[PDB]
Amino acid sequence: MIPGEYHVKPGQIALNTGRATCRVVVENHGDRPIQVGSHYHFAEVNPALKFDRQQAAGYRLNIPAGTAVRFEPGQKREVELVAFAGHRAVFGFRGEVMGPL
């Protein structure tokens, strides 16, 4: 007996089902580490991350909600992105959109 223990049903959960996705190669050209959270507007990340910003427009990382991807200086990764939903309106970040898209 363990107080408050879970008996999780074994299996898997599919995330962001039915949503458009794309893959982009990213490289940290900066000299300091960069970590990006699941819901950040990927096209507006730190300018030291080099990738196809046009392809990334209106996308975020396709990872579990609340998690993040880390890029050490010089690190390269191909990341998977998922399109924003709802109204598809972007406000904040580096102030590059500030409206629909």
Partner 1 sequence: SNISRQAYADMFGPTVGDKVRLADTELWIEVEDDLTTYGEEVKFGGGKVIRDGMGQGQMLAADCVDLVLTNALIVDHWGIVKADIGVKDGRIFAIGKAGNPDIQPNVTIPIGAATEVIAAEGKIVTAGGIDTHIHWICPQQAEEALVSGVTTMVGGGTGPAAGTHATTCTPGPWYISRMLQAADSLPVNIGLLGKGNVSQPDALREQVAAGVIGLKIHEDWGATPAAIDCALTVADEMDIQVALHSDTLNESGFVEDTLAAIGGRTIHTFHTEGAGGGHAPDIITACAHPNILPSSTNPTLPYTLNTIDEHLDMLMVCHHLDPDIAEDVAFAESRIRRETIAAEDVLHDLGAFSLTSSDSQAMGRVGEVILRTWQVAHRMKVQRGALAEETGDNDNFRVKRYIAKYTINPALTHGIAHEVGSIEVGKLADLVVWSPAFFGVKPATVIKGGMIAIAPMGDINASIPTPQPVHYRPMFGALGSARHHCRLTFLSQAAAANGVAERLNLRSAIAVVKGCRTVQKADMVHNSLQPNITVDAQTYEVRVDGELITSEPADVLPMAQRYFLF
Partner 2 sequence: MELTPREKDKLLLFTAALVAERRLARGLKLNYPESVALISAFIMEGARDGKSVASLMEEGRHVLTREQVMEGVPEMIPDIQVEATFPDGSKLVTVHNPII
Q: What is residue 44's three-state secondary structure?
A: helix
Q: What Rg, from alpha-carbon coordinates, does the chain have?
A: 16
Q: Least distance (Å) from partner 2 to the CB of residue 72?
A: 27
- Whose tokens are 């399109």? That residue is 83
In the list partner 1, partner 2, none, the entry touching 54 (Cβ below 5 to 8 angstroms by class) is: none
Which one of residues 1, 13, 14, 65 is an interface residue with partner 2 (CB under 8 A)?
1
Residue 46 binds partner 1, judged by CB under 8 A: yes
Q: Least distance (Å) from partner 1 to the CB of residue 24?
A: 15
Interacting residues with partner 1 between 7 and 36 (CB under 8 A): 7-17, 19, 30-36
- Ramachandran region of residue 43, left (φ > 0), alpha (ψ -120 to 50) or beta? alpha
Token pair of 84, please?
Answer: 């924003």
What secondary structure letter does DSSP report for 54? H
Token pair of 6, please?
Answer: 């879970």
Residues of the shown chain interacting with partner 1 in the complex, contacts defined by CB under 8 A: 1-17, 19, 30-41, 44-48, 60, 62-68, 70, 72-73, 80, 82, 84-95, 98
